[PDB]
């Protein structure tokens, strides 16, 4: 008959933004899982080995632009 040379696929990795704008986060809380820097680390946000953006401090998450880059900041809580 016939057969397919396809049928392989990788497991779902579950990327994407995990905390949206204004959401209160704790220090170290993961903000976005991603491959490559679609979002760059902004103020109060660190970037991990697999390009995960996480919170360096408590506060509220905001998405903005720092110079020419899309960045994610954590504004310290009032």
């Amino acid at each position: 008959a016939s057969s397919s040379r396809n049928g392989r696929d990788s497991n779902a990795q579950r990327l994407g933004v995990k905390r949206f704008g204004g959401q209160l986060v704790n220090a170290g809380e993961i903000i976005v899982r991603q491959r490559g820097t679609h979002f760059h680390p902004g103020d109060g946000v660190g970037r991990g080995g697999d390009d995960t953006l996480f919170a360096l401090r408590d506060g509220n998450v905001e998405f903005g632009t720092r110079r020419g880059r899309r960045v994610v900041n954590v504004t310290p809580v009032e």
């Binding site: 008959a1 016939s2 057969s3 397919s4 040379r5 396809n6």
Partner: peptide, 11 residues
């Protein structure tokens, strides 16, 4: 689909 064949076995 290849003639006279059951459904499946790829496009």
């Amino acid at each position: 689909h290849p003639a006279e064949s059951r459904m499946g076995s790829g496009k």
